[PDB]
Amino acid sequence: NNLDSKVGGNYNYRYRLFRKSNLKPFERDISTEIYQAGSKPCNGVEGFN
Amino acid sequence: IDGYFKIYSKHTPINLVRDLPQGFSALEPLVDLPIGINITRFQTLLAL
Ligand SMILES: *[C@@H]1O[C@H](CO)[C@@H](O[C@@H]2O[C@H](CO)[C@@H](O)[C@H](O)[C@H]2NC(C)=O)[C@H](O)[C@H]1NC(C)=O
Secondary structure, rough: OOOOOOOOOOOOOOOOOOOOOOOOOOOOOOOOOOOOOOOOOOOOOOOOO | OOOOEEEEOOOOOOOOOOOOOOOOOOOEEEEOOOOOOOOOOOOOOOOO
């Protein structure tokens, strides 16, 4: 904290929140793409679900 | 394998005709590399 944290918050640090399934042992995922949570597919930059 | 890469190889003389040979020989390991990427395809490179 005495290195990393910022009074607005240090948002240069991130994590993955959504995925189709759990990743493999020592398997990393470098994806920025939109997750589809709905039954609907999702296309372009944003959408419902 | 699971975050690892390896090669093994062998070389021999034979005087057959047009096919892979009727005998037994074995490959030693050559090199190992921690590449750690999904791999799904390959291609060979040859000169002219
Ligand atoms: C490595 O990449 C392959 C290909 O991109 C991944 O397999 C794909 O997974 C999706 C989701 O299940 C399928 O829609 C594709 O049809 C699959 N393609 C192939 C060629 O298998 C694979 O899951 C990746 N491995 C890791 C560990 O992320």
